[PDB]
Design a protein around this ligand. Structure first.
Ligand SMILES: CCCCCCCCCCCCO[C@@H]1O[C@H](CO)[C@@H](O[C@H]2O[C@H](CO)[C@@H](O)[C@H](O)[C@H]2O)[C@H](O)[C@H]1O
Ligand code: SF4
Ligand code: SF4
Ligand code: FCO
Ligand code: FCO
Ligand code: SF3
Ligand code: SF3
Ligand code: F3S
Ligand code: F3S
Ligand SMILES: [Cl-]
Ligand SMILES: [Cl-]
Ligand SMILES: [Li+]
Ligand SMILES: [Li+]
Ligand SMILES: [Mg+2]
Ligand SMILES: [Mg+2]
Ligand code: NI
Ligand code: NI
Lengths: 264, 581, 581, 264
């Protein structure tokens, strides 16, 4: 049977969300691409460049108008008439708007597409702007995190393909399945938090016993994500398990909530 | 039109202009323009970074301890290297010395990234320039098996395997949804592999796509996650506990066992899949040992990396050598000093920035990032560029120079520096590789040589992973567990005014972060990143950067199909988010 | 010495007595003795279980909801199967019906066990009876690659791979530290594989030892851990949440994706490694199609398993057929009723137990487990058995019979029941397999047949994993998430007195748990386990069980080296902890 | 480079500890057996049977007297003069004592060898007895659990090989590294326990959100093991993560501390 067309575009970004996607353990990103979806445009991976890539973009959004999913990594800058991000000699935002207009739905991968992420941190030199403030007439599913968890990205994809529907979302457009609870409400160090058992300086005796990172600035109490349950890289670890507090990286404006080492 | 001479090239922008925008199978946003003469030879090349975010502006006023997390997000491909450069820079400014285990674990994080990044670049980014994926449908599975088995001990070589991979590709394209293969350059006359080598390479493309996800489990153990692991100023946050209560909350024997298992698997994949494929590309594409030389026979630069003596960044400590060569004089490897205002300088006369005097270069401690989008007299308009004007400002990339010289950085650069400094392992590796190809040493100074050196370096880094792991275990056997120094963690302990340099060799070349701290806050934070060097625009003397030079004098079989431009550009492994930051 | 006739055999304890104690490469503790005549042919065989723990006694007074956790520890090899039989028995007693997803997930747990258990038996338990590991050191790696590639599409077949395996084995043995290979039967004339087949099989032994760990990840997702996953009376505790807040705390789409990935890899390993290896053992050891028939052409028993209609244990629901054949009459497959006191009975006249009358057999609802270690004259002492006294009590295993008949259970028994009931998939699979070996159907009724059927069943179970997974996903797509029924969780809801039977097909054969509940506690818990059937001692009529029958009439090349005895006993996959409980 | 000789014996058991051992993900059990130890006797895995296996046993304990590690799975029964577990026609306890006498140290794998496990639960028909009540003159490392975690077993082996020393132990002989803390002091559902957020009956709304299993009888608060941190089967799950309370299976006498479904 034909696979669902997907167009994956890139604005201002670091490409962490593409890299996260290809880490997927189950299904492998290989199997997502060969068997689950038709990844019809993606600057990072496609053979064609230049005029050949422009022909792919135009052919897919025309032939599959109304029928493709648009994945967005990164975000558009409004500064300098949009020419902080140039694609085919024109502002990126024009490509975002053309791709959005034909899409059935939009996946905003990462904190960049969802909220703004690092380029939007003060003083936001480029006026980097999240997708939902530019595209106001399409369903947008926010999948935040810098980047999101690989097997969360692939589970959201498999949910959509298998169940033939968007995931149910919270009031911010995040999938309830992975963003319904806070890091701190599924954290294996919560016993230590409840007991007042805290790391006070790096590599102290508390640190060597896996005590709570709250006094080292952990933002798990105000951050919604699946890192403390699903974990990272085929379940191997997450920030807190390896001894660093949560930075808050799945939350809007997390770069500007103060030092990562200042307590909540 | 104009013509001028620089670095032995004749830069001539008469004649037909070709535009490649977007450049794909890179990180980030790049535009390339060339002029070609009647003989389909490039006489002009223009490298343009088409993105900017402004991390150097965003860092101002932040706490130096937070800086690594911000600058890590310069790039998710070379993830972690900017965090390493950052903690180095802040420690250099404040006067912090980390414990040996923190230095060993940082060296493991960097070697892990070299392995991962180089492997993905070889297969997913550059590979389809060399491997004709659709031609793999014509291969004989048994001849494919026989070829693979002649080149490698790698177990996965049965005729049935190659048949199964070939049938997966046949099914994939059967519905007309060619995905990432759509409208490619397949059948271009520069595709030279036989069908059996295309099917072998395509099978390996898929094996590498799967396997790369395992490598970064080392980052997850020590750094929490990949992409974008965590770090601290003072060491690493991954406290160690082998034999005490609460080891379940720390890096313990089970976590170290997982790291060891990934190291072995990573070396085996690189040595038995990536290395023989790189050699096979060399065997079938020898003419590309003479294409894309660029600056690689003139000017190359390495800062050096992997300090083996903790907190010693000198020549006796760095396992990956530093040095610079200019004027093609490889008998004179020159020492690099990142504080010397006469050495590293960035120019913006051909970039979208403001300086008080755009005819001079500024050392990064005097750096300015004042963005100014001013493309001037383009063909088209400022929001609809048909042709950049390379006589004026044409890029978001600043132009770094070393003592005024335009330099190439990256795996070929490092291989040349280490070879000409007399590093025994580099000399042996390079001599054996070029002997197997029946090519002269000069053949590494090329687009093919960039790819061969990158594969070499993945093998080198896999070996160093074991070395660093064993050093860490030796410390733990001796009861040396420390991972952080915290006596200067608190801002009140810092100098009121100080500055530092953090440098390393990222997968793509020489990286530096220059940081000034004043009154507990970042006063200045300037980055010069490897793709900034290689993708550089011109300087006030008209001197061209590594990409523009490597594209000069290139023959194109079919002007409308930029396969030869993509081959040379991809051989440098461009990271445009890195280049612009 | 004495001689008597039973089941067509002449049981004769004249001649040399051989003792094999311990039997190795089984689970738990077994002793076997035989007598051989002047032609080195077995004329008497004695099966002895050399352990007892008493789970039927320990279960008295427990809460029925806890029973599964206790009886799961009957055995860590067939881990989970006793938990399944237990929750079936308690649900049958109380009158509990579980939701469809719980039944589907239980079937996934059982099919996962069949795959895992059969794979490890083939390689780690039985394999070294058929593969001469030391002879692998004489193989030609290229001829090994050719053999492997002629038999299978499996990728891992390169000459370099086989040389690397061979070299690892060479280095392992070179220092004299032969480990598990010490003092083996290597070079025995019954080792018939050529060296290349030995190296291929040894390589696959190592691949299976690695891969088996992955199969049980399915048990970890639904059951928390393996060995010994968790279960509940009323369904399973692995609550499902796909699309609601808090799915991070439940079986969600990421957890199900992990299960799917393991299913695919499990089928691929079984279909392309174990199936071709089993057929190759058959090709090189055809005489073993005529050795160890035992009761397999007389009396075979299956209870059936894998109810596809939740809470329906009838013939239209069970995907694995139940039935009995006696007196060699395969044209009349008889129905089994586990409540009928005239069907399943256990005797103890030849076992270390007390009954009020040891001349009669007790149905398990009338079962008694009163241990009585009474070996009589064993030519030594009660603490020094030199020769078991098979005229009196000689085992910790009770003697189960079906309508007074001695039965064989397990993969070959099940295959014969399904074949003769006219199951289409089974008839076609069996006929094609025996055709490929150029053997008659009767060749399956043998030691070789037990091995072929076991491998076939691993393939069948890997297919059923996908079927069950797809059934679970269909329910989830239809919004049917339920995994537990709790209407009768509380003891106040139970009958004051009730009894139930839980039955299934464990990897080794027909399993039943009989439970009587009174006043909220277990009043009686009796288990009859597949190895109890097969390893059974004699009954009051002198009838021999499946092991003793299969060993009768067997030629031994070298009496002091029991390779033929081991081959036949291992072909039944003995689990002695199961047999004795 | 010779490998350290290991003798692995089996008393009354279910073989779950051998099975757990072969699950090891890192190092693979293959690599432990080929490169790290010399597994010179093991009834579950060894080629030789009967008199050939008796010759291996006698040869190894004689040649390597004072220098081999003894691994013990299962336990000896003292009832019926020890003939509830018979090996080579004699009580298993005789083989245990012969193997112990030549060992440099003993690893008591699992709750069986450490404490008694299921056969020792009331009314202990066989008088099953843990190793340390029979062998009183040798170092015994207890590695309890039914069975212990695969990668805990292999981590303890690699520790001993790499560091050339026994692990440091608590007052019960359990390695501090994996048994120093309770399941409940590293449980990812502790947030719910703190909040009074409990499953009250199977598959209720609380169960479907991953709430605490305390009211369903979880014994995590009184059990020392690594399940809630290292987890099981290459970090895939543990009992509580899959929705069942901890049974208490690493602790002495856990079968007889009341119903698994009665709260602590
Ligand atoms: C199934 C494998 C079982 C574990 C295998 C372990 C192999 C490695 C063991 C090396 C341990 C060190 O050995 C220990 O040293 C101390 C201190 O000198 C002695 O005192 C002990 O008697 C000795 O056993
Ligand atoms: S480490 Fe962070 S998320 Fe975990 S309990 Fe402490 S504050 Fe909460
Ligand atoms: S589930 Fe058990 S171990 Fe976890 S918090 Fe609740 S009571 Fe404690
Ligand atoms: N490698 C890499 Fe990224 C670039 N250029 C950095 O630093
Ligand atoms: N399979 C199995 Fe174990 C036995 N015999 C059970 O039941
Ligand atoms: Fe993930 S591209 Fe990387 S910066 Fe934070 S999400 Fe963006
Ligand atoms: Fe682990 S052999 Fe299995 S019963 Fe509890 S440990 Fe014993
Ligand atoms: S920093 Fe991000 S990756 Fe998870 S633990 Fe915190 S939301
Ligand atoms: S039952 Fe056992 S396996 Fe761990 S979670 Fe509890 S100690
Ligand atoms: Cl943000
Ligand atoms: Cl106990
Ligand atoms: Li320093
Ligand atoms: Li029922
Ligand atoms: Mg800069
Ligand atoms: Mg019984
Ligand atoms: Ni980069
Ligand atoms: Ni069993």
């Amino acid at each position: 049977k034909p696979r669902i067309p997907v167009v994956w575009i890139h604005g201002l970004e670091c490409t962490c969300c593409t890299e996260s996607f290809i880490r997927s353990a189950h299904p492998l990103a290989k199997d997502v691409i060969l068997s689950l979806i038709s990844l019809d445009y993606d600057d990072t991976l496609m053979a064609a460049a230049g005029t050949q890539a422009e022909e792919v973009f135009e052919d897919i959004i025309t032939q599959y108008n109304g029928k493709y999913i648009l994945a967005v990594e990164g975000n558009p800058p409004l500064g300098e008439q949009g020419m902080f991000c140039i694609s085919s000699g024109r502002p990126f935002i024009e490509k975002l708007k053309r791709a959005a207009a034909g899409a059935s739905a939009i996946i905003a991968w990462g904190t960049c597409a969802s909220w703004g992420c690092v380029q939007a941190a003060r003083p936001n030199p480029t006026q980097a702007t999240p997708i939902d403030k530019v595209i106001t007439d399409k369903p947008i599913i926010k999948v935040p995190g810098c980047p999101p968890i690989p097997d969360v990205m692939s589970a959201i994809i498999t949910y959509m393909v298998t169940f033939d529907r968007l995931p149910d979302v919270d009031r911010m457009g995040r999938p309830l399945m992975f963003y319904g609870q806070r890091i701190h409400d599924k954290c294996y160090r919560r016993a230590h938090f409840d007991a007042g058992e805290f790391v006070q300086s790096w590599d102290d005796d508390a640190a060597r016993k896996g005590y709570c990172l709250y006094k080292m600035g952990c933002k798990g109490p105000c951050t919604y994500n699946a890192c403390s349950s699903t974990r990272w890289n085929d379940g191997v670890s997450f920030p807190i398990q390896s001894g660093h507090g949560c930075l808050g990286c799945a939350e809007n404006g997390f770069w500007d909530r103060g030092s990562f080492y200042s307590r909540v | 039109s104009t013509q001028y001479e620089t670095q032995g090239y004749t830069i001539n922008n008469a004649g037909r202009r070709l535009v490649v925008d977007p450049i794909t199978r890179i990180e980030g946003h790049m535009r390339c323009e060339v002029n070609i003469n009647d003989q389909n030879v490039i006489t002009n090349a223009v490298s343009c970074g088409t993105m900017f975010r402004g991390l150097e502006i965003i860092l101002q006023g932040r706490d130096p301890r937070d800086a690594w997390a911000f600058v890590e997000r310069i790039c998710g491909v070379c993830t972690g290297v900017h965090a390493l450069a950052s903690v180095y820079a802040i420690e250099d400014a404040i006067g912090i010395k980390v414990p040996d285990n923190a230095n060993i674990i940082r060296n493991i994080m960097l070697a892990t990234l070299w392995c991962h990044d180089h492997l993905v670049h070889f297969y997913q980014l550059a590979g389809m320039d060399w491997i004709d994926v659709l031609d793999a449908l014509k291969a004989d599975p048994r001849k494919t098996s026989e070829l693979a088995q002649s080149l490698s001990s790698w177990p996965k070589s049965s005729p049935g395997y190659f048949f199964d991979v070939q049938n997966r590709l046949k099914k994939f394209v059967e519905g007309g949804q060619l995905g990432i293969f759509r409208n490619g350059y397949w059948g271009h006359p520069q595709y030279k592999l036989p069908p059996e080598a295309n099917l072998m390479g395509f099978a390996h493309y898929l094996e590498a796509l799967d396997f790369q996800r395992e490598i970064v489990k080392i980052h997850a153990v020590f750094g929490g996650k990949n992409p974008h692991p965590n770090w601290i100023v003072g060491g690493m946050p991954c406290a160690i506990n082998i034999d005490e209560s609460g080891a379940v909350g720390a890096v313990n024997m089970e976590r170290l066992n997982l790291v060891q298992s990934i190291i072995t698997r990573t070396a085996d994949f690189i040595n038995n899949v990536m290395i023989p494929d790189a050699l096979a590309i060399g065997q079938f594409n020898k003419p590309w040992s003479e294409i894309g030389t660029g600056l690689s026979d003139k000017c190359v630069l390495s800062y050096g990396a992997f300090p083996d003596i903790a907190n010693d960044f000198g020549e006796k400590s760095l396992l990956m050598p530093g040095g610079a060569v200019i004027n093609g004089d490889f008998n004179n490897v020159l020492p690099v000093d990142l504080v010397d205002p006469q050495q590293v300088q960035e120019f913006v006369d051909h970039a979208w920035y403001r300086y008080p005097n755009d005819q001079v270069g500024r050392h990064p401690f005097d750096g300015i990032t004042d963005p100014w989008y001013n493309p001037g007299d383009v063909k088209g308009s400022d929001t609809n560029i048909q042709q950049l004007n390379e006589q004026e400002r044409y890029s978001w990339i600043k132009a770094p120079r070393w003592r005024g010289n335009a330099m190439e950085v990256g795996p070929l650069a490092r291989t040349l520096i280490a070879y000409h400094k007399g590093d025994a392992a580099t000399v042996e590796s390079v001599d054996r590789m070029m002997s197997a190809l029946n090519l002269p040493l000069s053949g590494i100074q090329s687009t093919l040589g960039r790819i061969l050196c990158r594969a070499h370096e993945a093998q080198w880094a896999a070996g160093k992973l074991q070395y660093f792991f064993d050093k860490l275990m030796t410390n733990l056997k001796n009861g040396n567990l420390a991972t952080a120094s915290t006596e200067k963690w608190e801002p009140a302990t810092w100098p009121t005014e100080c500055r530092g340099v953090g440098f390393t060799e990222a997968p793509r070349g020489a990286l530096g972060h220059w940081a000034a701290i004043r009154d507990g806050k970042i006063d200045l934070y300037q980055c010069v990143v490897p793709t900034t060097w290689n993708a550089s625009p011109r300087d006030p003397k008209g001197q061209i950067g590594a990409y523009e030079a490597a594209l000069m004098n290139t023959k194109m079989a079919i002007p409308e199909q930029p396969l030869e431009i993509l081959r040379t550009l991809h051989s440098f492994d461009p990271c445009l988010a890195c280049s612009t930051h």
